[PDB]
Amino acid sequence: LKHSISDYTEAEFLQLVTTICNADTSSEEELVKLVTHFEEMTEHPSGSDLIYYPKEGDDDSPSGIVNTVKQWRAANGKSGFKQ
Amino acid sequence: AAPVAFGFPALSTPGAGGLAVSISASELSAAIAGIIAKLKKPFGVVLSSLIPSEIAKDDPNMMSKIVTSLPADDITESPVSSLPLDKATVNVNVRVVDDVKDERQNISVVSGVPMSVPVVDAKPTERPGVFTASIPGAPVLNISVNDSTPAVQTLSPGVTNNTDKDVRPAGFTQGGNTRDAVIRFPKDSGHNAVYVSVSDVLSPDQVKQRQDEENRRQQEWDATHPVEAAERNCERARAELNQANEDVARNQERQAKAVQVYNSRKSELDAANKTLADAIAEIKQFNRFAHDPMAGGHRMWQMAGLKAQRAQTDVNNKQAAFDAAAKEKSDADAALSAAQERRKQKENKEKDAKDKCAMESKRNKPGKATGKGKPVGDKWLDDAGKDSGAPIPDRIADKLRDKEFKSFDDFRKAVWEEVSKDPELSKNLNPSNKSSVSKGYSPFTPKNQQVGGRKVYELHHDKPISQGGEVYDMDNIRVTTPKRHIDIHR
Numbered sequence: 001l002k003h004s005i006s007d008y009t010e011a012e013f014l015q016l017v018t019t020i021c022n023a024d025t026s027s028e029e030e031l032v033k034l035v036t037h038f039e040e041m042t043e044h045p046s047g048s049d050l051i052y053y054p055k056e057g058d059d060d061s062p063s064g065i066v067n068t069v070k071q072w073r074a075a076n077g078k079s080g081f082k083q
Numbered sequence: 084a085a086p087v088a089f090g091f092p093a094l095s096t097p098g099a100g101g102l103a104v105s106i107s108a109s110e111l112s113a114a115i116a117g118i119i120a121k122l123k124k125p126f127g128v129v130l131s132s133l134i135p136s137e138i139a140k141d142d143p144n145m146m147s148k149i150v151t152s153l154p155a156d157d158i159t160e161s162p163v164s165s166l167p168l169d170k171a172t173v174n175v176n177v178r179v180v181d182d183v184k185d186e187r188q189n190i191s192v193v194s195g196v197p198m199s200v201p202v203v204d205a206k207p208t209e210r211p212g213v214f215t216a217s218i219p220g221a222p223v224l225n226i227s228v229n230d231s232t233p234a235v236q237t238l239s240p241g242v243t244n245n246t247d248k249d250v251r252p253a254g255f256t257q258g259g260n261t262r263d264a265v266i267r268f269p270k271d272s273g274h275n276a277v278y279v280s281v282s283d284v285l286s287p288d289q290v291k292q293r294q295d296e297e298n299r300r301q302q303e304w305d306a307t308h309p310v311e312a313a314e315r316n317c318e319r320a321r322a323e324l325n326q327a328n329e330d331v332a333r334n335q336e337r338q339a340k341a342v343q344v345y346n347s348r349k350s351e352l353d354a355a356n357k358t359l360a361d362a363i364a365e366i367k368q369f370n371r372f373a374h375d376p377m378a379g380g381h382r383m384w385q386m387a388g389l390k391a392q393r394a395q396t397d398v399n400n401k402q403a404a405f406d407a408a409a410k411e412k413s414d415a416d417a418a419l420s421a422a423q424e425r426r427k428q429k430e431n432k433e434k435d436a437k438d439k440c441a442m443e444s445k446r447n448k449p450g451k452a453t454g455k456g457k458p459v460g461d462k463w464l465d466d467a468g469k470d471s472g473a474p475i476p477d478r479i480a481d482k483l484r485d486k487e488f489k490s491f492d493d494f495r496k497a498v499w500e501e502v503s504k505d506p507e508l509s510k511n512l513n514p515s516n517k518s519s520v521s522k523g524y525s526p527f528t529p530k531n532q533q534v535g536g537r538k539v540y541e542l543h544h545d546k547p548i549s550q551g552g553e554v555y556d557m558d559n560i561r562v563t564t565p566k567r568h569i570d571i572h573r
Binding site for chain 2: 003021028035036051052054060
């Protein structure tokens, strides 16, 4: 129901990343569906690693990841959040 | 504005003012209700198949979409009325979705999982009883209710109506060119909420693409669900056999039928050949009178002339027919040999399949864990992407051995649960990853070890389950990253 990261508000996107980090799912198949979806929204090169294999000194808590995506996308000429 | 029946896919060429659709009030036919009832107790049923070749004869530009519509209450468990105005998405029990199966794009009624769709309100317009729903990603869908004219089902050379309403499994890519929504009207209109899906008509190039993508996703799912990938083949290999057997039967009919026709035509000839011999003797008889034109006999002779050319033409006709029958009989005899050779191959296929279906069925039946495993280091999960993968760790083997597991699926869940609690094996897992291991699920790999949808560490076996290799034997088992395993087998 969401084809671009610009369909998400910052607070909406945060929820998805807090769902994924806590593994708040009914199945591993719906988790992996969420992560595969997250990846596409970010368009980020690290990919899934933003969540499970962060760089040194990055913040991997739900928010810090929203924060990494945010400033990366902005800094490489990409659309932002809703609003 | 003759209204289109609910649940009967039709082309709507758009305008600048959006698509034009005209619904009815009259409730959906026995047919579709049937389907939704049948389907109630991801799979689905095909309403229509699309043929771009034809759709373009009338819509050369390929601007036309395919609209299909249902009254919302038949879809949704919670009446649309008794729903908050804040909700943008109501849950639905079925949807109408484009699927790609057997090399045509096709519109179909889907089900069997949790689904939920956009809900959009319909602004009115100058015209009386005519509103504008705008579903994200479709054109402006301007609707028009009509319970005056009797309902119609529109018929377009492109859109066919596939009778076979068997429930089949559905596309992985289902919906990839569809936009639907339950649309509600404003309260002082008295019009029921209506469901509408609007799908693109894919061109054949685009269909081959979906088809391709559909086949690739099927591969994945097949390797990550051995339990029942095999249990699927056993159906295909049994169906192919049951079909091939009938082939023998129908051939036998033709060949047993060709044997009588042969025999019949053969005797028809024989008879006709005696008749010639008789007539040709009768001409020898009166041969005498051949040059005496004024004798009794020179009539009786001429008469035998005729008897013979007649009897002769007859033979020629019985011969063609006999030859022809002889041909048919020979071809038929080969048709069984060929057709019955096919059954022998199909009967071998169905054995191989059914043997594998029971060995791959073991990994879904109870057993006790066994083996010792092997020592490991800090780079345990790192090793799962090198060599022949990392093995089960000794320390893990010890904690698990002799325990009883309802299914190998449970044995994996458990292996990870002993990895989450071990600080040195679990040294490589992050807080977000640890949330998954202790929730059962298999932990995620690094990007560079992922492949499409296989993003997590896998348990495989050395001596495979399909070659009778022990399901629960931990000396057998190997942890591998998706990429690593893929590489290992090439």
